[PDB]
Design a protein around this motif. Structure first.
Motif, PDB file in Angstrom:
ATOM      1  N   UNK A 102      30.204 -33.866   9.745  1.00 43.21           N
ATOM      2  CA  UNK A 102      31.159 -33.222   8.804  1.00 43.21           C
ATOM      3  C   UNK A 102      31.394 -33.804   7.555  1.00 43.21           C
ATOM      4  N   UNK A 103      30.565 -35.113   7.531  1.00 44.64           N
ATOM      5  CA  UNK A 103      30.844 -35.945   6.210  1.00 44.64           C
ATOM      6  C   UNK A 103      29.797 -35.699   5.174  1.00 44.64           C
ATOM      7  N   UNK A 104      28.493 -35.446   5.757  1.00 42.19           N
ATOM      8  CA  UNK A 104      27.087 -35.294   4.979  1.00 42.19           C
ATOM      9  C   UNK A 104      26.888 -33.567   4.916  1.00 42.19           C
ATOM     10  N   UNK A 105      27.379 -32.941   5.883  1.00 41.94           N
ATOM     11  CA  UNK A 105      27.078 -31.502   6.103  1.00 41.94           C
ATOM     12  C   UNK A 105      28.168 -30.820   5.196  1.00 41.94           C
ATOM     13  N   UNK A 106      29.414 -31.284   5.337  1.00 42.80           N
ATOM     14  CA  UNK A 106      30.627 -30.638   4.692  1.00 42.80           C
ATOM     15  C   UNK A 106      30.267 -30.701   3.333  1.00 42.80           C
TER      16      UNK A 106
ATOM     17  N   UNK B 116      25.139 -39.052  14.811  1.00 44.80           N
ATOM     18  CA  UNK B 116      25.745 -38.335  13.793  1.00 44.80           C
ATOM     19  C   UNK B 116      26.235 -37.178  14.296  1.00 44.80           C
ATOM     20  N   UNK B 117      26.719 -36.816  15.225  1.00 44.99           N
ATOM     21  CA  UNK B 117      27.477 -35.739  15.789  1.00 44.99           C
ATOM     22  C   UNK B 117      28.862 -35.750  15.058  1.00 44.99           C
TER      23      UNK B 117
END
Length: 27
Positions: A11-15, A6-7
């Motif tokens: 930026x899809x879940x953390x963004x 999930x590297x």
């Protein structure tokens, strides 16, 4: 770096979290 769990998607879940204030403050 060999096998990306999930590297590249981080930026899809953390963004969402970072862009949540302005989102819920300007929908």
């Amino acid at each position: 770096k060999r096998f990306w769990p999930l590297v590249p998607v981080a930026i899809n879940t953390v963004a969402a979290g970072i862009n949540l204030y302005k989102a819920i403050r300007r929908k």
